[PDB]
């Protein structure tokens, strides 16, 4: 049970947009379908030397500082049927979450309630014609899983999000 005592240092972690180009005798094929949805035969596609400016942000339940959908909210999952599988959601418009070491994160109430009904306009049923969509919060598990954990200014934040995922829609 390996323990390692390194000179634990107070550094500042900053994200450098990472570009991933073609690896050796291989070629990167970008699908240009504005609304490509996961698995499937991409129609419009083209070879590229490198992907794009990818910002490697480590965090939970909320993907941040990344790529948005240019058309509508697009969701993706390996199997929308198996409840055990993660469902990723690509948003239409960015939302802001301002945080400080003082223990809080505030995000606009209106901006976020709107994205919720948008995401609600297509959940599991599969853009289902209609049914009741409910947003509750984590059942349990690790702190990093149960809360929006992320690395802010070098420090590790564990933001309680019950208020973001506790509502009902149709």
């Amino acid at each position: 049970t390996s323990v390692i005592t390194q000179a634990c240092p107070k550094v500042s972690f900053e994200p450098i947009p990472i570009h991933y180009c073609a690896p050796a005798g291989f070629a990167i094929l970008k699908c240009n379908n504005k609304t490509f949805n996961g698995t499937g035969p991409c129609t419009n596609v083209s070879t590229v030397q490198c992907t794009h400016g990818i910002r490697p942000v480590v965090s939970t339940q909320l993907l941040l500082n990344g790529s948005l959908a240019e058309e509508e909210v697009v969701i993706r999952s390996v199997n929308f049927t198996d409840n055990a599988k993660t469902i990723i959601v690509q948003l239409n418009t960015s939302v802001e979450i301002n945080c400080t070491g003082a223990g809080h994160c505030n995000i606009s109430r209106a901006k976020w309630n709107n994205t919720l009904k948008q995401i609600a306009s297509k959940l599991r049923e599969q853009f289902g014609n209609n049914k009741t969509i409910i947003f509750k919060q984590s059942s349990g598990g690790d702190p990093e899983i149960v809360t929006h954990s992320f690395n802010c200014g070098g420090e590790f934040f564990y933001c309680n999000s019950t208020q973001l995922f506790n509502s009902t829609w149709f």
Partner: protein, 83 residues
């Protein structure tokens, strides 16, 4: 008027690692003005079960597999063998 969703937050030093199944401890803060401004660009959810195809569907926040974080940016890409 200017109703903002205030979320209680906490800075922990002992954390469960995301890299591999481990635990780690970092030094406490030195700055008195840790300030971040991020743009939520997405969401990673999960759905309650045992209610397949019925009237309601519960969805809770998720995450954990950092791969699912890279997947959201790399979805539209693929590496093909070239001669």
């Amino acid at each position: 008027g200017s109703d903002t969703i205030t979320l209680p937050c906490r800075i922990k030093q002992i954390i469960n690692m995301w890299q591999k199944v481990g635990k780690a401890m970092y030094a406490p803060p030195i700055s008195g003005q840790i300030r971040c401004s991020s743009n939520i660009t997405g969401l990673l959810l999960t759905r309650d079960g045992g209610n397949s195809n019925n009237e309601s569907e519960i969805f809770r926040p998720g995450g954990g597999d950092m791969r699912d974080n890279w997947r959201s940016e790399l979805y539209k890409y693929k590496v093909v063998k070239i001669e």
